[PDB]
Amino acid sequence: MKYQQLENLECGWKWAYLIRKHQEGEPITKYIENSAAHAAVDKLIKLESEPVRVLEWIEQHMNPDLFNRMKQTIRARRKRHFNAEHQHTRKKSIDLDFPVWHRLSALSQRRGNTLSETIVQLIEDAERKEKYANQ
Amino acid sequence: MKYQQLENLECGWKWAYLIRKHQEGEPITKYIENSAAHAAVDKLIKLESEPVRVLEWIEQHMNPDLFNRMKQTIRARRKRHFNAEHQHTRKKSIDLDFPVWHRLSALSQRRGNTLSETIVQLIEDAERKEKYAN
Amino acid sequence: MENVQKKLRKLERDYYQIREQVVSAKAGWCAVMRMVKDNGVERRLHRRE
Amino acid sequence: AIRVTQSDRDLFKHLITEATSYVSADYMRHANERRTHLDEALALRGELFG
Amino acid sequence: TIEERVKKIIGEQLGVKQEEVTNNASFVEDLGADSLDTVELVMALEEEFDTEIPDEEAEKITTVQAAIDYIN
DNA sequence: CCACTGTTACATTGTAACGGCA
DNA sequence: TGCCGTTACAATGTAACAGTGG
Ligand SMILES: *P(=O)(O)OCC(C)(C)[C@@H](O)C(=O)NCCC(=O)NCCS
Numbered sequence: 121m122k123y124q125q126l127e128n129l130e131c132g133w134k135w136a137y138l139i140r141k142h143q144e145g146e147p148i149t150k151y152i153e154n155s156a157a158h159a160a161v162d163k164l165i166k167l168e169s170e171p172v173r174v175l176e177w178i179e180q181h182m183n184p185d186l187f188n189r190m191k192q193t194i195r196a197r198r199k200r201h202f203n204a205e206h207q208h209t210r211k212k213s214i215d216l217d218f219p220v221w222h223r224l225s226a227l228s229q230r231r232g233n234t235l236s237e238t239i240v241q242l243i244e245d246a247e248r249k250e251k252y253a254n255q
Numbered sequence: 256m257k258y259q260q261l262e263n264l265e266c267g268w269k270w271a272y273l274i275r276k277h278q279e280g281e282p283i284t285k286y287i288e289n290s291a292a293h294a295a296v297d298k299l300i301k302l303e304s305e306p307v308r309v310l311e312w313i314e315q316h317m318n319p320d321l322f323n324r325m326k327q328t329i330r331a332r333r334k335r336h337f338n339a340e341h342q343h344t345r346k347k348s349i350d351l352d353f354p355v356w357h358r359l360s361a362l363s364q365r366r367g368n369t370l371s372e373t374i375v376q377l378i379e380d381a382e383r384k385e386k387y388a389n
Numbered sequence: 390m391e392n393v394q395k396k397l398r399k400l401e402r403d404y405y406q407i408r409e410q411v412v413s414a415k416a417g418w419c420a421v422m423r424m425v426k427d428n429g430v431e432r433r434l435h436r437r438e
Numbered sequence: 439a440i441r442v443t444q445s446d447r448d449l450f451k452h453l454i455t456e457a458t459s460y461v462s463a464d465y466m467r468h469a470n471e472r473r474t475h476l477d478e479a480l481a482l483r484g485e486l487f488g
Numbered sequence: 489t490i491e492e493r494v495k496k497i498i499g500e501q502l503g504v505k506q507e508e509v510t511n512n513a514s515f516v517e518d519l520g521a522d523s524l525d526t527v528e529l530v531m532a533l534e535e536e537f538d539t540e541i542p543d544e545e546a547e548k549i550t551t552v553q554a555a556i557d558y559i560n
Numbered sequence: 561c562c563a564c565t566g567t568t569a570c571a572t573t574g575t576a577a578c579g580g581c582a
Numbered sequence: 583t584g585c586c587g588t589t590a591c592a593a594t595g596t597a598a599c600a601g602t603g604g
Contacts, residue, residue: 121565121602137595143278193595195565200593207413208406211568212356213591214349217371221347223378225569234568236352242377243358245384251391251398257587275573328574330586335573348570354402360590369589397486404482408531411479412501414472415528419503436462476524479531487543 123202131171133194134178138164141186150183258337266306268332269313272325273299284316493536494556501525501532514551526550533559 141148142161149157160181167173178190203209216224228238277283277296284295295316302309317325338344351359363373425434498509502521515521521529530546537559541549549558 123566140594189596191564192597196567196595199566206410207353208410210353211350212353213593214351214356214370215346215590216349216374218343218345218347220371220374220378221349224374227378235349236355236568239351239355239359239374239377242374242381243355243362245381246362246377248395249380249384251394255391256585272574324575326585327576331574331588334587348572350569354406371589400482400486404479404486407475407479407482408535411472411475412528412532412535414468414475415532416500418468418472419500423503433458434462434465436458436466473524476527 123198125198128171130194130198131174133197134190135164135167135171135174137190137193138174138178138182148183148186149181151181258333260333262306264336265329265333266309268329269325270299270303270309272328273313273317276321281321282318283321285318286316490537490560491556494533494552494559497532497536498529498552498555501529509552511553511556512551516550 138148142164147157148164149160151157151160160177164174164177164181167177182190200211203211224235224238228235231238231241233241273283277299282292283299284292286292286295295312298316299309299312302312313325338346359370359373362377363370366373366376368376422430495506495509498504498515498519499506502515502519502525504519508519513519515526515529530541530549533555534540541558545558549555
């Protein structure tokens with residue numbers, strides 16, 4: 121663990137995730153019966169201002185499918201929340217045309233390094249040419 | 256006009272967009288009084304499965320300030336929907352560390368090229384340097 | 390010594406990063422201070438404990 | 439009257455103390471982090487200038 | 489412009505009013521910026537115009553007029 | 561072994577800003 | 583001008599790999 125886990129924040133994150141999934145129409149509950157599922161969802165809604173009880177509601181009515189997605193999404197959210205503090209740790213999203221991305225990904229898999237590292241190497245070779253031109 | 260517009264598709268897109276915005280809390284309607292806003296939203300909700308009437312609903316009750324955002328969202332949706340058919344026209348999304356992105360954007364702004372064009376040029380120069388050495 | 394020049398460039402980029410972080414933090418702090426003119430800051434916010 | 443006044447006083451006390459404990463903590467953390475970052479930055483500035 | 493970008497930087501780095509920051513307004517006595525505050529002010533001035541300044545020539549700057557004079 | 565965490569590489573949708581064109 | 587394509591982001595969600603310690 122590199123990032124401090126805060127209980128009263130991650131609990132709210134989890135509750136918001138459950139509510140978003142439900143309102144999107146997915147079956148967060150493990151219940152096939154309509155009545156029990158509706159009651160469990162209503163109780164989760166009541167749990168809005170008590171994120172602490174959300175862990176118990178998860179252990180009581182959460183669909184067994186969603187544990188992996190849960191542990192993935194909140195983990196990623198924690199990383200992003202702690203990285204957003206400083207610019208130099210942030211990430212920037214860009215879109216690439218299929219040919220360009222294909223060539224770049226092939227090159228990266230060839231060199232066995234991540235996309236950012238490959239871009240660093242390319243721009244660094246270009247900047248080396250520029251530097252030797254400058255000297 | 257490059258992409259042909261289909262009414263039964265874009266109207267469903269608009270209905271879904273407005274329902275999403277309403278569920279997100281955005282004020283869909285121009286009525287400040289809550290009763291009229293609720294009535295209009297109910298009309299929209301029960302208005303599902305209708306292009307020719309969702310268009311009229313937008314014309315009649317749509318919030319004035321959301322027109323531009325909805326128009327550009329539908330523009331992007333149309334372009335992406337038509338481009339997603341073939342592999343070569345699709346777009347690949349990646350995340351770049353901030354320093355790397357900063358340097359790449361510096362180059363792109365300096366040379367007037369886009370990120371795709373800049374990366375193409377950089378790879379081509381790397382290949383040319385390889386051939387020079389080899 | 391072009392390698393030394395490259396080292397200088399790397400240190401320059403690091404220093405740019407740190408200076409930008411510091412200046413942004415200072416600007417945010419100044420904005421907050423101007424926004425707390427309601428006199429809730431003298432003791433209530435700046436708890437030196 | 440006693441019930442209402444006691445409820446209002448307790449609400450005031452709880453809200454005030456909780457809000458102060460919520461904000462001042464991050465405020466002081468920001469101050470300390472800014473000072474530390476400045477102290478680190480000066481060394482890089484000097485070495486780059488040399 | 490430069491002569492108002494300087495004010496943009498000074499006011500938002502010291503938090504003082506735009507009216508207070510005149511050409512001759514010294515940082516330490518008029519604007520109240522102390523050692524670290526002035527250090528951050530010079531760093532921000534460097535960042536705004538993407539330039540660099542010598543240590544001694546920078547520390548010589550102790551006023552809005554001097555700030556612009558070195559900037560312009 | 562096993563689980564939990566950090567990270568990368570996508571996708572998905574929305575938005576603002578340019579620039580072309582009737 | 584207003585529509586229409588296009589780019590460059592932001593925010594969030596996921597799968598897969600790599601680490602780490604119990
Ligand atoms: P303020 O009275 O706290 O003074 C701060 C400072 C002027 C001493 C500080 O900002 C500073 O300039 N420190 C470095 C001094 C120097 O020239 N060192 C050489 C390079 S590390």
